[PDB]
Amino acid sequence: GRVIRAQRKGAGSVFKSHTHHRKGPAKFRSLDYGERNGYLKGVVSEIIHDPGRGAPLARVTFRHPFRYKHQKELFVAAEGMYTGQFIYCGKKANLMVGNVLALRSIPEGAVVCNVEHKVGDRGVFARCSGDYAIVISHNPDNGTTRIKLPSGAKKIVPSGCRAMIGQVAGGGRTEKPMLKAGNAYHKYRVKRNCWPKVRGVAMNPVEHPHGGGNHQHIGHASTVRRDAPPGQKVGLIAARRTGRL
RNA sequence: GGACCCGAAAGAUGGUGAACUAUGCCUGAGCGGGGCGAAGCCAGAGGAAACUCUGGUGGAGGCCCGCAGCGAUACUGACGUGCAAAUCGUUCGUCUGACUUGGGUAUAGGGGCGAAAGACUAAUCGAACCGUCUAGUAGCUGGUUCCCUCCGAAGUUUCCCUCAGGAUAGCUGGAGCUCGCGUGCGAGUUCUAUCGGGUAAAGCCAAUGAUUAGAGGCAUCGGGGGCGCAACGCCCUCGACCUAUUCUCAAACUUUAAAUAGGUAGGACGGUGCGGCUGCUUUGUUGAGCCGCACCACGGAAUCAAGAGCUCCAAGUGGGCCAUUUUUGGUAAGCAGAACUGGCGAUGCGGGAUGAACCGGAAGCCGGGUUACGGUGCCAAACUGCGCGCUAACCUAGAUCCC
RNA sequence: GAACCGGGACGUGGCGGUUGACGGCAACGUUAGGAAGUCCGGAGACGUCGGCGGGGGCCUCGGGAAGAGUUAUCUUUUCUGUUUAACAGCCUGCCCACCCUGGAAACGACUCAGUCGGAGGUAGGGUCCAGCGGCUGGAAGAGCACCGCACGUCGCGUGGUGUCCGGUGCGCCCCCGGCGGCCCUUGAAAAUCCGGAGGACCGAGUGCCGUCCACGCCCGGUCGUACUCAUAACCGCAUCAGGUCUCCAAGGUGAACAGCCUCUGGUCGAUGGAACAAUGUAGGCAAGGGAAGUCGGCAAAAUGGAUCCGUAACUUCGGGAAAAGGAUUGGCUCUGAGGGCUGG
RNA sequence: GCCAACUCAGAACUGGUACGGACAAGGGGAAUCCGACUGUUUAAUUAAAACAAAGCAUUGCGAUGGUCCCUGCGGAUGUUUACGCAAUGUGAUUUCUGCCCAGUGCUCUGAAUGUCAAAGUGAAGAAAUUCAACCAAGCGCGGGUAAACGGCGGGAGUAACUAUGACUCUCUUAAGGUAGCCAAAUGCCUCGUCAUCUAAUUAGUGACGCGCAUGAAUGGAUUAACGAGAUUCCCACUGUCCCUGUCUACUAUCCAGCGAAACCACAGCCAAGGGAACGGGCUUGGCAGAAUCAGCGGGGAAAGAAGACCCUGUUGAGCUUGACUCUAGUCCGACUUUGUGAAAUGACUUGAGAGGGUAGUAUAAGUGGGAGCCGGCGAAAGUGAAAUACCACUACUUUUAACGUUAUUUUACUUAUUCCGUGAAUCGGAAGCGGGGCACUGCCCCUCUUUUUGGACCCAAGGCUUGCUUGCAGGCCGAUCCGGGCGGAAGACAUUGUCAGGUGGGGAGUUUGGCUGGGGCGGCACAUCUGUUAAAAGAUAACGCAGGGUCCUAAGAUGAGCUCAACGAGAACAGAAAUCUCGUGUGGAACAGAAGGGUAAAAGCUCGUUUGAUUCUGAUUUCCAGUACGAAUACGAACCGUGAAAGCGUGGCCUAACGAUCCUUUAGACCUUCGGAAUUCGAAGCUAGAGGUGUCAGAAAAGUUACCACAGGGAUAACUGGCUUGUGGCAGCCAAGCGUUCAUAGCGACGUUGCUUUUUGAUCCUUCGAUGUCGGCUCUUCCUAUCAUUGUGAAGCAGAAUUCACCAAGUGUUGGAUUGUUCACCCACCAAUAGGGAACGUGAGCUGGGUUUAGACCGUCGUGAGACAGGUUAGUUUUACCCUACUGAUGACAGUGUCGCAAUAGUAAUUCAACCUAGUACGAGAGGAACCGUUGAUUCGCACAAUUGGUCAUCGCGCUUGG
Numbered sequence A: 001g002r003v004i005r006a007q008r009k010g011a012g013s014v015f016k017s018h019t020h021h022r023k024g025p026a027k028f029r030s031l032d033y034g035e036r037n038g039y040l041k042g043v044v045s046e047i048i049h050d051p052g053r054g055a056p057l058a059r060v061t062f063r064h065p066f067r068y069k070h071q072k073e074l075f076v077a078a079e080g081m082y083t084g085q086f087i088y089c090g091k092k093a094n095l096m097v098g099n100v101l102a103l104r105s106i107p108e109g110a111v112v113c114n115v116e117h118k119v120g121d122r123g124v125f126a127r128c129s130g131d132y133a134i135v136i137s138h139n140p141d142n143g144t145t146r147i148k149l150p151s152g153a154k155k156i157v158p159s160g161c162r163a164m165i166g167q168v169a170g171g172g173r174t175e176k177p178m179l180k181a182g183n184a185y186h187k188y189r190v191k192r193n194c195w196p197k198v199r200g201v202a203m204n205p206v207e208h209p210h211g212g213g214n215h216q217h218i219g220h221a222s223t224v225r226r227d228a229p230p231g232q233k234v235g236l237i238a239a240r241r242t243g244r245l
Numbered sequence B: 001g002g003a004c005c006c007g008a009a010a011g012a013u014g015g016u017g018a019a020c021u022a023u024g025c026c027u028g029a030g031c032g033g034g035g036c037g038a039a040g041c042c043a044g045a046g047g048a049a050a051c052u053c054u055g056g057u058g059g060a061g062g063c064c065c066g067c068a069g070c071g072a073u074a075c076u077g078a079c080g081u082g083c084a085a086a087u088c089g090u091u092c093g094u095c096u097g098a099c100u101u102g103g104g105u106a107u108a109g110g111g112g113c114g115a116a117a118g119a120c121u122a123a124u125c126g127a128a129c130c131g132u133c134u135a136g137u138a139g140c141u142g143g144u145u146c147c148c149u150c151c152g153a154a155g156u157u158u159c160c161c162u163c164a165g166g167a168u169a170g171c172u173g174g175a176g177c178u179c180g181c182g183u184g185c186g187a188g189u190u191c192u193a194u195c196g197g198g199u200a201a202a203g204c205c206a207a208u209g210a211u212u213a214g215a216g217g218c219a220u221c222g223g224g225g226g227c228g229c230a231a232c233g234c235c236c237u238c239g240a241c242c243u244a245u246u247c248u249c250a251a252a253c254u255u256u257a258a259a260u261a262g263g264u265a266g267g268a269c270g271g272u273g274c275g276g277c278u279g280c281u282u283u284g285u286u287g288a289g290c291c292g293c294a295c296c297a298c299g300g301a302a303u304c305a306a307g308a309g310c311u312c313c314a315a316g317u318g319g320g321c322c323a324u325u326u327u328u329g330g331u332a333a334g335c336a337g338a339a340c341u342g343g344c345g346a347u348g349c350g351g352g353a354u355g356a357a358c359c360g361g362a363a364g365c366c367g368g369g370u371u372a373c374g375g376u377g378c379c380a381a382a383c384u385g386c387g388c389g390c391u392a393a394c395c396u397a398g399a400u401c402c403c
Numbered sequence C: 001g002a003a004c005c006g007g008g009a010c011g012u013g014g015c016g017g018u019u020g021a022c023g024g025c026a027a028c029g030u031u032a033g034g035a036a037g038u039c040c041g042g043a044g045a046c047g048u049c050g051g052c053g054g055g056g057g058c059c060u061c062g063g064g065a066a067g068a069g070u071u072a073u074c075u076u077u078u079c080u081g082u083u084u085a086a087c088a089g090c091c092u093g094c095c096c097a098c099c100c101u102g103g104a105a106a107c108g109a110c111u112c113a114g115u116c117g118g119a120g121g122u123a124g125g126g127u128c129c130a131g132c133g134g135c136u137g138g139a140a141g142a143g144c145a146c147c148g149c150a151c152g153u154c155g156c157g158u159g160g161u162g163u164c165c166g167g168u169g170c171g172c173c174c175c176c177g178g179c180g181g182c183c184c185u186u187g188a189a190a191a192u193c194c195g196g197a198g199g200a201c202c203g204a205g206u207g208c209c210g211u212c213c214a215c216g217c218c219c220g221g222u223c224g225u226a227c228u229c230a231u232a233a234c235c236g237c238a239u240c241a242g243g244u245c246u247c248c249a250a251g252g253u254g255a256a257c258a259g260c261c262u263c264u265g266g267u268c269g270a271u272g273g274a275a276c277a278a279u280g281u282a283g284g285c286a287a288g289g290g291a292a293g294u295c296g297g298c299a300a301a302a303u304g305g306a307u308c309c310g311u312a313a314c315u316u317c318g319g320g321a322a323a324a325g326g327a328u329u330g331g332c333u334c335u336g337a338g339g340g341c342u343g344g
Numbered sequence D: 001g002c003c004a005a006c007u008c009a010g011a012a013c014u015g016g017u018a019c020g021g022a023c024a025a026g027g028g029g030a031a032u033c034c035g036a037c038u039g040u041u042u043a044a045u046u047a048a049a050a051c052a053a054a055g056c057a058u059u060g061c062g063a064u065g066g067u068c069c070c071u072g073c074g075g076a077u078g079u080u081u082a083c084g085c086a087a088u089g090u091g092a093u094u095u096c097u098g099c100c101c102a103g104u105g106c107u108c109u110g111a112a113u114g115u116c117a118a119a120g121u122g123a124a125g126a127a128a129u130u131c132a133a134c135c136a137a138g139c140g141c142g143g144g145u146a147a148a149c150g151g152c153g154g155g156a157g158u159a160a161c162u163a164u165g166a167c168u169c170u171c172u173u174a175a176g177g178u179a180g181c182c183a184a185a186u187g188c189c190u191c192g193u194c195a196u197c198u199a200a201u202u203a204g205u206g207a208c209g210c211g212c213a214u215g216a217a218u219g220g221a222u223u224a225a226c227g228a229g230a231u232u233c234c235c236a237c238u239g240u241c242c243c244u245g246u247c248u249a250c251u252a253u254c255c256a257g258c259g260a261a262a263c264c265a266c267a268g269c270c271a272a273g274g275g276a277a278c279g280g281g282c283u284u285g286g287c288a289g290a291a292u293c294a295g296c297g298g299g300g301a302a303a304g305a306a307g308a309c310c311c312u313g314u315u316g317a318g319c320u321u322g323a324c325u326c327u328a329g330u331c332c333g334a335c336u337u338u339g340u341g342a343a344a345u346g347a348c349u350u351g352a353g354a355g356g357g358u359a360g361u362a363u364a365a366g367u368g369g370g371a372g373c374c375g376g377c378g379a380a381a382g383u384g385a386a387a388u389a390c391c392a393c394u395a396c397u398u399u400u401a402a403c404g405u406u407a408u409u410u411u412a413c414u415u416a417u418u419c420c421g422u423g424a425a426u427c428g429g430a431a432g433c434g435g436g437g438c439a440c441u442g443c444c445c446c447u448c449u450u451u452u453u454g455g456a457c458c459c460a461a462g463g464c465u466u467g468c469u470u471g472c473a474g475g476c477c478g479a480u481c482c483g484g485g486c487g488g489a490a491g492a493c494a495u496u497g498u499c500a501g502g503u504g505g506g507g508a509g510u511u512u513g514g515c516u517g518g519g520g521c522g523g524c525a526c527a528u529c530u531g532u533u534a535a536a537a538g539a540u541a542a543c544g545c546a547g548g549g550u551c552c553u554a555a556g557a558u559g560a561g562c563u564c565a566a567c568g569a570g571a572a573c574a575g576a577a578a579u580c581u582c583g584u585g586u587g588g589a590a591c592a593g594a595a596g597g598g599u600a601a602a603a604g605c606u607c608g609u610u611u612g613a614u615u616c617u618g619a620u621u622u623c624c625a626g627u628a629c630g631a632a633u634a635c636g637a638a639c640c641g642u643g644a645a646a647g648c649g650u651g652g653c654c655u656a657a658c659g660a661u662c663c664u665u666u667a668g669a670c671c672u673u674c675g676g677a678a679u680u681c682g683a684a685g686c687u688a689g690a691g692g693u694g695u696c697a698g699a700a701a702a703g704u705u706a707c708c709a710c711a712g713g714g715a716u717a718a719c720u721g722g723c724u725u726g727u728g729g730c731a732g733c734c735a736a737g738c739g740u741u742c743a744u745a746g747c748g749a750c751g752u753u754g755c756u757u758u759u760u761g762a763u764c765c766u767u768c769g770a771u772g773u774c775g776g777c778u779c780u781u782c783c784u785a786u787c788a789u790u791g792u793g794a795a796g797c798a799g800a801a802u803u804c805a806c807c808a809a810g811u812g813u814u815g816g817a818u819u820g821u822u823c824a825c826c827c828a829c830c831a832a833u834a835g836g837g838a839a840c841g842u843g844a845g846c847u848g849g850g851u852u853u854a855g856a857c858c859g860u861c862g863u864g865a866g867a868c869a870g871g872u873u874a875g876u877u878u879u880a881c882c883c884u885a886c887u888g889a890u891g892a893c894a895g896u897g898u899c900g901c902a903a904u905a906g907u908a909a910u911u912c913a914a915c916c917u918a919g920u921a922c923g924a925g926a927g928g929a930a931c932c933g934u935u936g937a938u939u940c941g942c943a944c945a946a947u948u949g950g951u952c953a954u955c956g957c958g959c960u961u962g963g
């Protein structure tokens, strides 16, 4: 008869993201004439740590195409990039790690990161540390490029979508064991109030379908309907299978 | 309808709280002295080499003892109308981190928040607090205010999600009305005459069923012994069978069959003789009812009759209990359940020492007389009255229905 | 009494015109020493822990002088105080950072720990940075201590002496510097201020144009400000043994803001008196036995600091571990070892 | 030479061996269980094994998305992007994680139309409307899934002693407990069996295992280190105890001052009696003497609270789901938003064409004339059930356009709509400057200027041309022209809105009968019949006794004929039992069913004819209120059956076999109404049946609560008390037998009479506005049904020992292991280690180990919430100052004092050992007493401190730490 924790998540106010010390969103430059037709050069000034994000970020300074001022950008760092490096963004940019190129100019089998979904969206795919997308094939008839995403899915995107050459830096982070609750506490303190987690079978019936019983047990199948209403949809949602492979 | 008065656990609606506590966020602050001695580094020794070893340096850890801080294990200590609606004393856990803490800020009631105890959300939490709907509804508990006088119950029937309730009939009050004065439309009573019964008892030597014992007979058709190869051959024992007897039995057996109790009748609403009506009935004014006229009818058994009949409105009651006799279950019960009557309940009074039911007896306020039951050695009113026997208790002799 | 900040306006003097200073090889220095739209950088501006070093205050030892305490005996001894603010100038120049000469293995330099060097070490010579560093002015005239004269009811009167010279440190509080450890944690923003890139535009010859320089002049609103901050000034119905954030922090013992005693400061506020029955509450002891008590060793007792010797099974090899088990500990009189500065 | 600090290590000397001198400050060891550890938690009874945790595993999701919030609009995750976010389970490391997809879930690019709404389409009708096809998701079917919920049994045969079963086959239901582990925090029996630990062990440890009911991420096994966690043992230690004593402070005490509260019908001495079954009051007795002080915990069934346990109410509430009825969300179809075009494919139109036999070649598929048809067939018959010849139309399978209908797909456009990016900064076309080839003057093919470097980059130089002569100012190129789309993506799909179907404990509301020797479980005594209880009219109770929702066109109606069961005697197979003959035959047969009645030319059996099992209403009986229903009975008014007729028949031979209102539906009338008038559909009326309420005078209805609540109930359970005494315990009587013979020394079978309330039952009288619920500890008293001790009788009593019995309750009846234990069982001592009451004595006397709140684990059960007579661990014990009682203390008792008497009340002593008797009596031996006397001792009681021991704040003396 009580709202469950998963339900309470949506209202927020204690489950909102912790973003006080973050350095702003990481994204490509806004797509413009220079990147569409030629190439534009910037310089990497700093490599910084973004709290709550495994991958390091890169500060890049560009010369504004048509204004007398500096254009400052924050890119998701690719492995191998260093301070003082020159980054080239555009259709005519060379195929080097750290450069941002339109997928139409990236040959097949290339490893890229921060791939745009819609032309000009400034990058939404393969942004986490150690992750990357792979260019599979091109279709000039409809101007569409096929990519393999980190999850293994194959997606078709417009060939004008941009992507940075190389993989995201910081790979191998999840290999290290944490060994203690304090490390997880520190990890999630800068992410959100999602830790520690209380098991449903440890609660009373009033606040969870798994609660109750003189023994600790679910008492009914943990697989639930895809259309099960909020508050009832707990456990393995719409599972096509369970158990070991 | 507030509905005689007071009372629920709840439900609904609209508002108020994160000054406590829970969690996230922002910005500040706080945490002796010791122990162990990880990486990294320096030097030396052994060895053919590989490599091994030793002594220093350094200071890691959700590491250890421990002060402050934070918390609260045991005494199940103190106190337990306390210093205190959670405190005090000793003891105890942790103490550089998942650490402690101030202020600001966010989350508000079927909502929040929860390292999860249904915990916390202002001494309020398995749904906060404040006002209102609201005099919420209660077959349930408690109260329900002057006097005398008259009458005066019920715990039983049927129906009800009915079993602590209600309606219904019965019991009761009030109002009367119709008549009547012994010629009485009557009666919890007898008498006379007529009917029904299957209990008590009795019966099995009567049907059905149960059951003991012997006696006399019988078989080409029972088990054995003897005489025998067998024999429908012979002699005996026990069994069946027949006959006449015999012990003992029945709520769901019975021929017979009480006591008590049940029904009907004993005139004025009768009888007799004529005539009439019918569409009913008959072969038949043959019957069956009914209707007119004439005559007779001493009231047609006893006793009593503080009279008989009729109607309307309505209260309370619908938990009963006890006793002689009859009687079911139960070892029995101050157990549980039925029949008739009476009693207590609703009722005092004398007796049984004492007592709701036993015995007596029922009652306005008094004087006198006499009794009922029970008593007359004292307590305590009335004889140590007149008489006959029994008992002698070295066990507390014995001493009055229920008891 | 002596300073500072912000704002306003001018006057005097100074500074530049090679229109927009000079010096240094350089780091950079000097009180001044153009400039508009536009653009760029820095400060503000940041976690935590450990060692080391510097500064201020405190603590502490010795000497000089002033006063006081003790003095049956000893005590050149015991006690108190012996001060220097903001601000201005000059000097100095921690640890770092930076610059010039030069070119290094037989490698050297170097910290407690690290670390650094042909991407230029050692060495020689310099620049800059901090300071809560030094001297001077402020400022001895002030404050403090001591010794005198005077009114002796009301002179907040009047005068003198001193305020000096050294040592020491794993000491305590605060600030700072520079390294190192930790993170799947990397530990605010803005107002505001400073600097820089560019040079449109701008002036004269005995006066003009500028000037962040020196001195002089004027002004600076509104509200809070007492007191308590707690065993009686807040909350708990109270003058309630509870609860309520934080700053300062002496001496002795001792590892120690442990316990105990003491100095400054505070305080004797818990209604008082008499007696010392039982039963209680709190705190001890108890011959012999030693858990037989009790559901149960509940409670209490025992052990305990430091130094030396020594330490098993098991083990995730990190521990177990202070395992277990033994010895010592006072006072007094000595001995030895462990340092700094100066001088060829 | 001048200064400087406290660290370390040694050596003498020395004190009453004192010296971390106060203070400060681990007890240790050997094991088992749980949880890895650090951390967190029920503020005010539970700190834990519970929660979290790192590690492990599973699930969804690529943004047009997953999860979630929101009335709506829009939002959180998201300053994000799979090394991520979201939803779960397990719980370090090590090792392992077996079989089962039948069930419930979840899931799928699977077959298919078995079912499937609204809208839309077609037929009929005057229309309302009814019929058909088409028909989404979902459901059904199929597949996959167990680190999803969960499950892991039984049977038969089989090895050469037996036993088991490697092996083979089978059933429910998919499989049949694998590796492991165990009387476990998990085992009932159970205190299981064995070993060990102890003197003794329901405890601990190890082992065994058909294990009521162990078992593998509902995780199994182990595990160093850790723990205010649960357990066992050992060492040290001790006032826990033997067994108490003593010391200090503060109280209590007394005083000055000050000064409440709880509670109070009236009050307060007892024994018994009865009584509402436990009185302070009543009855009968005992007694009983002013006024006061300090305690005390027996009583006041003391106070504290309208019992929280249990039951009842037509009272809730938290939670759950396979309960009833709904609902947010979600999926799906239609219409709308919604505009502009082109093609395929499947049906329906018509239109031409091909095919078929169960047995036979064959359309003989179906039909008519065929005797005649266009050389060909019948005209003959082989199958035959029905003819081939010439005509079509009828059914089934099968191709394709002229016209038209319908449905599903593919695809085109962008302006509606939706989404993305930007400070809407170069978008579309063309042309020029340059670079390539061709062959010859034109073509086509490409580019927009920036890639060794951690620099800077803006506000136009230049050329041409005007005002007039420039303070300077105005135009073009530099800087191509033209496009009145900021740049893209999806796109009439998505999205909004309205209806329609599915899903929907996420959420709302509600329900979850009654009787009942408490309630539940059980049963139905709830409608209802027979016999009996039932007491010879009727009526009559119990969860008394023994039993009983249909069936029949005949098993109803009528007429006729006959007589059944059984027995006796006879007849081949044939007999106990087949069919047949005669005789007897009162029903001993049959009549649907339970039982009781009833019936013989019948009510039974056979046969003939039949539908009175018919229509119409009234009356009566049974039940009973003299209501209804059911059932039955006697007439009346009709039509019939049967019989010759009287007559009989209104269902079953009689006594049971059944059902209101509302609604639905059927039958009846030339019936009534639709209210402005007519006709016709439709609807509504009247009369009689049918669909049913079995809780049967008739709601529509699942659990749980230990998180719990309210109104009440002693109308009703869980103690004591009261009745009873079956059961338990303790006695008696008779005498068949036992006892070498002998019933009775000692016993007592078969029977039979009693007593007791320390057993357990039975009951429900008292108590539910509360009488504190086990056991132990302490303390007193009482009983005898006597264990020991004193005195006796009897013996199958030689002695010793033992047994039976009589006076007898004066005295005593113990220390320990295991268990919470009562109980039990062992060890030990002893004269003995008897049995019991006192509200199952005794909690304002204690304790709190157990039972019996809330936390938590295991096993079994349940889908679940949760349950458990199963186990386990942690879990607040309140108040006396009132009256009485009792213990002591003043006082009263007629001046004061001393010495005394004395009723009455209380009372106290107990048991054992040794020596001698005595190796005596007795006895064949073995063995083996007792009186007297002497010396000690046990338990208990009253005193006392010479000695010993204890006690210190003599604060007495000494020593000593820090200040």
Ligand SMILES: [K+]
Pocket: A001, A002, A003, B110
């Ligand atoms: K809710």
Ligand SMILES: [K+]
Pocket: A193, A194, A195, A196
């Ligand atoms: K959290």
Ligand SMILES: [K+]
Pocket: A197, A198, A199
């Ligand atoms: K968890």
Ligand SMILES: [K+]
Pocket: A201, A209, A210, A211, A212, A213, A216, A217, A218, A219
């Ligand atoms: K559950």
Ligand SMILES: [K+]
Pocket: A201, A216, A217, A218, D218
């Ligand atoms: K579980």
Ligand SMILES: [K+]
Pocket: B003
């Ligand atoms: K009324």
Ligand SMILES: [K+]
Pocket: B019
């Ligand atoms: K607050």
Ligand SMILES: [K+]
Pocket: none
């Ligand atoms: K904070």
Ligand SMILES: [K+]
Pocket: B109, B110, B127
């Ligand atoms: K609420």
Ligand SMILES: [K+]
Pocket: B139, B164, B165
């Ligand atoms: K009632």
Ligand SMILES: [K+]
Pocket: B202, B203, B256
């Ligand atoms: K008879």
Ligand SMILES: [K+]
Pocket: B204
């Ligand atoms: K008979």
Ligand SMILES: [K+]
Pocket: none
């Ligand atoms: K009534």
Ligand SMILES: [K+]
Pocket: C046
């Ligand atoms: K800050």
Ligand SMILES: [K+]
Pocket: none
């Ligand atoms: K640091």
Ligand SMILES: [K+]
Pocket: C086
């Ligand atoms: K200042």
